[PDB]
Design a protein around this ligand. Structure first.
Ligand SMILES: [Mg+2]
Ligand SMILES: [Mg+2]
Ligand SMILES: [Mg+2]
Ligand SMILES: [Mg+2]
Ligand SMILES: [Mg+2]
Ligand SMILES: [Mg+2]
Ligand SMILES: [Mg+2]
Ligand SMILES: [Mg+2]
Lengths: 140, 42, 68, 78, 105, 166, 55, 97
RNA sequence: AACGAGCUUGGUGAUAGCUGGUUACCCAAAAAUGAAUUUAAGUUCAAUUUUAAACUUGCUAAAAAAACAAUCAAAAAGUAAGUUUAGAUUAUAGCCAAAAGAGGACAGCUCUUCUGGAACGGAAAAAACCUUUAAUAGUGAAUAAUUAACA
RNA sequence: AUUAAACCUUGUACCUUUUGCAUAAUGAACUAACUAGAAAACUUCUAACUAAAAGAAUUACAGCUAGAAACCCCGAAACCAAAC
């Protein structure tokens, strides 16, 4: 016994301190806790890049709900807003609906009008001045 | 000389300050880590 | 936007119309974050503590001018 | 299995992209003869840099200050 | 560790930026050894950097208490009452200077 | 071995101010190395919990279990050392605040089997702890009424917030 | 067995050997050991070159 | 695991005792003393490994050579078996051939 | 108290091409083909791979012309590797899809040759098919395969 | 993640092993302690002196001397000797 590890207590503590909230023997036995913790760390790493995709799917649900109140499907709302050259991401649009309902109606009406203008342009062929909102600003 | 002059300014040479010449020694690889443990190179 | 009107840029408003002023309240770093790649022989030690710098800002004032 | 409608549209678009690539590759700016020797100078210089790196391998300079600097570890306040 | 750890919401001390910005760092205390290799880097910090830092931040009371010591220690006190101590054992002046600036901010 | 339940009986609190509520008495008694199982003893200890000492000395007397007499003895020692050495005015002003049984040191012996084989036998002992607190038994738990059940549901709904947004 | 400022010796050798090779020779200066190292064999040229200086 | 519930006693080393103070003196007895004595002659140790170093198999054989005839029966038997084990290891086993 | 030949001690740490095991972090590169062998549960060599060093042309492509879609390859060009020297192993059973022969100038089946792969995305199933240059924090964004068919 | 412990979403134990696949097949009830890579011929790296190096015998057509740097564990059926 010339050399023995005098600090193995803290090595076990590092693994165990990450297992107290568990249930069963895994929260107190090193042979069982250690296996449980690794999965806990791996899932935490594979879930940092799944809250960025679920939080977006949440937004699409709420934007689909928001536009439907004013009579617009989700595809029509987003596409037309871009076609008007206004760029608002799916995170603020949900904020606008929840906390600024009156402003969202303006966006819904604006998106609806461009949709109507686009329909008119396709329906009316030839050289005709496009809708007032249909006009696209150019940056050089 | 000029190099000898630098030694005068530096602290006293003692048994603590001793250092081996750069790259003179090598790391002795032991079998206790994943790269060099498990099947242990065999 | 306001209670009764809103102004939308295409895609940005002109500087004269809107001036947003903020202050740098505090500069910090993020709490330790655990990265552990899904791989065979995961082990408990093949884990890295990612930490990032952070700053906190207060949006002091949003002011508008009659230059429509 | 039935071929999906969206799948047909996707490949048709890819076919169009490749088909156009035929067109842009059918108009060579320079003929075979006109190409010969036009870039000889640049190529030769590039290889010379490669050779210089390969034959410049050699150990590094050693300094007394670096080794004597280890004594600074024992610096103190009088 | 997210489920295994506590959490909170974004917050300030006393609405720091609403009125006048007040520096949160309140006090820094550094203990050093006259003759110790580990505290050599910190001794350089006191010689040069400490004076500049004290003037730059005049709301941070700085205490330097050289004593026979094994590990140099920096203790940071904030206005909300929170304490923070970081070990400076065998850290060069560059590391300490960067480390201290994080504490002030 | 660790005898800490014995020491807790010696704690001295500081004198009270003239209008402070009169501190209820606490007594700490136990018996060790009882020839009985800790699992069997728990049922007896659990029974008496939250009862007076003249209501726990009656239920025990008519139980057939061996431990009933053992517990009764340490519920009478506790009832005597409280009045004499802990200044409890009335014998009938006590109630069993806590009571549980703990493992003791055991002995290892050989239980023989039928083919030249055997198994390891353990002769089991246990300890039994009781605390008595001066005062009538705290009134029992009152089941939640239907109105109380309904109120919690509303309170739960009221706490609702809009999640994952400003 | 170099003594004094070894760097001056390196500069002098670099000029001396450059015209023959047509390029600056690759060299190492070991200040602690007081030696100068040159790639390739130039023993004969350097011996005479050092002889002229009188070292 | 379990750790001590009290601090162990302080260990005090006197670095200016006679043995430590004069450690190393006469290590250059040869070059400074007209090579009368080789420094290896100053080593205190087993007779078979004063001023000598080798691996265990060589060490085993060298111990036998110097004191093979003055050893106890059991010690000599163990040494013989120790030599035969090492011989088959170093001459018939190992990763490299 | 288990005799195809008792038991105890010693030889003895018997020997095992066989089974099992072989304890900190980090960065990087990285393959089951040919030959012989009481050989096919092994080893040795070639080939591959690797660390270092030396100095100079290498890979794709390669017109005409040969020997007949290959074996060979010159000017070019796109591009950065290739050769020699010193040291060193493990490896020497593949798995599945898609092409082409060849066994009965068959399909299959067994081989042989070339090509590709080893998701967190997709295809009821889902290591092998299709989309995918490494890994990092963000309550950003544009996208791929596909989400069956309306004959 | 969350206002909220559980409900909601995502997720086919570990090691060894088989092909680079397992819903296989081996091994683990749990805790504490113990429990398995070792040698310098050739090479690389670092220095001392240098047609010489080495504190006797050695090597040399830039060598020579010194330093550092390497090759595990457990397990048979058996065989022989001598007692009992
Ligand atoms: Mg070793
Ligand atoms: Mg019997
Ligand atoms: Mg039992
Ligand atoms: Mg092959
Ligand atoms: Mg064979
Ligand atoms: Mg074999
Ligand atoms: Mg088992
Ligand atoms: Mg063995």
């Amino acid at each position: 016994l010339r050399n023995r590890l005098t600090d193995r207590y803290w090595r076990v503590q590092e693994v165990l301190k990450h297992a107290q909230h568990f249930r069963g023997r895994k929260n107190r036995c090193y042979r069982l806790a250690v296996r449980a913790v690794t999965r806990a760390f791996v899932k935490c790493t594979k879930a940092r890049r799944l809250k960025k995709r679920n939080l977006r799917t949440l937004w699409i649900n709420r934007i689909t709900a928001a536009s439907q109140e004013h009579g617009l499907k989700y595809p029509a709302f987003i596409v037309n807003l871009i076609k008007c050259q206004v760029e608002l991401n799916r995170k603020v649009l949900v904020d606008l609906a929840i906390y600024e309902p009156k402003t969202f109606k303006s966006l819904a009406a604006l998106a609806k009008r461009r949709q109507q203008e686009g329909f008119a342009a396709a329906l009316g062929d030839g050289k005709e001045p496009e809708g007032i909102f249909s006009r696209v600003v150019q940056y050089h | 000389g000029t190099s000898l002059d630098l030694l005068r300014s530096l602290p006293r040479v003692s048994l603590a300050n001793l250092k081996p010449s750069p790259n003179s020694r090598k790391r002795e690889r032991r079998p206790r880590d994943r790269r060099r443990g498990r099947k242990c190179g065999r | 936007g306001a209670d009764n009107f809103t102004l939308l840029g295409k895609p940005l408003l002109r500087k004269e119309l809107v001036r947003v002023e903020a202050t740098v309240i505090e500069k910090t770093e993020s709490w330790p974050k655990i990265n552990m790649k899904f791989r065979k022989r995961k082990n408990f030690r093949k884990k890295k503590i990612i930490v990032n710098p952070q700053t906190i800002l207060r949006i002091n004032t949003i002011e508008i001018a009659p230059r429509l | 299995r039935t071929v999906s409608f969206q799948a047909k549209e996707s490949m048709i678009r890819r076919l169009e992209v490749e088909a156009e690539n035929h067109y842009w590759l059918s108009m060579p700016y320079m003929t075979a003869e006109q190409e010969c020797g036009h870039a000889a100078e640049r190529r030769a210089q590039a290889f010379e840099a490669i050779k210089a790196a390969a034959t410049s391998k050699f150990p590094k300079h050693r300094y007394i200050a670096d080794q004597l600097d280890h004594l600074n570890i024992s610096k103190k306040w009088s | 560790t997210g489920r295994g750890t506590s959490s909170r919401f974004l917050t300030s001390v006393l609405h720091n930026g609403l009125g006048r910005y007040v520096q949160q760092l309140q006090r820094l205390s550094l203990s050093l050894s006259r003759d110790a290799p580990s505290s050599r880097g910190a001794r350089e910090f006191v010689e040069r950097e400490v004076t500049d830092f004290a003037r730059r931040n005049p709301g941070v009371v700085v205490y330097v208490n050289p004593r026979p010591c094994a590990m140099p220690r920096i203790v940071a006190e904030y206005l909300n009452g929170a304490v923070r101590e970081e070990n400076v054992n065998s850290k060069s002046v560059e590391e300490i200077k960067s480390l201290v600036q994080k504490l002030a901010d | 071995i660790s005898r800490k339940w014995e020491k807790k009986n010696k704690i001295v609190y500081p004198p009270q101010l003239p209008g402070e509520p009169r501190r209820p008495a606490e007594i700490y008694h136990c018996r060790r190395q009882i020839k009985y199982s800790k699992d069997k003893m728990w049922y007896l200890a659990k029974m008496i919990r939250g009862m007076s000492i003249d209501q726990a000395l009656a239920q025990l007397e008519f139980n057939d279990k061996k431990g009933a007499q053992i517990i009764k003895e340490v519920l009478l020692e506790a009832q005597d050392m409280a009045v004499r050495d802990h200044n409890v005015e009335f014998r009938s002003n006590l109630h069993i605040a806590e009571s549980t049984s703990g493992r003791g040191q055991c002995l290892k012996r050989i239980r023989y089997h039928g083919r030249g084989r055997f198994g390891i036998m353990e002769k089991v002992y246990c300890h039994y702890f009781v605390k008595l607190v001066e005062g009538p038994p705290p009134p029992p738990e009152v089941p939640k009424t239907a109105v109380d059940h309904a109120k919690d549901y509303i309170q739960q709904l009221r706490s609702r917030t809009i999640i994952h947004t400003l | 067995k170099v003594e004094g400022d070894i760097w001056a010796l390196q500069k002098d050798v670099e000029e001396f050997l450059s015209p023959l090779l047509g390029k600056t020779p690759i060299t190492q200066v070991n200040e602690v050991t007081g030696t100068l190292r040159i790639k390739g064999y130039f023993d004969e040229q350097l011996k005479a070159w050092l002889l002229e200086k009188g070292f | 695991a379990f750790v001590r519930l009290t601090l162990p006693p302080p260990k005090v080393v006197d670095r200016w005792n006679e043995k430590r103070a004069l450690f190393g003196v006469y290590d250059n007895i040869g070059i400074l003393g007209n090579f009368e004595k080789h420094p290896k002659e100053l080593i205190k140790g087993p007779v078979w490994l004063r001023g000598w170093r080798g691996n265990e198999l060589q060490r085993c054989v060298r111990k036998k050579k110097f004191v093979g005839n003055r050893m106890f029966i059991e010690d000599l038997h163990n040494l013989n078996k120790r030599i035969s084990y090492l011989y088959k290891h170093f001459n018939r086993h190992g990763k490299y051939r």
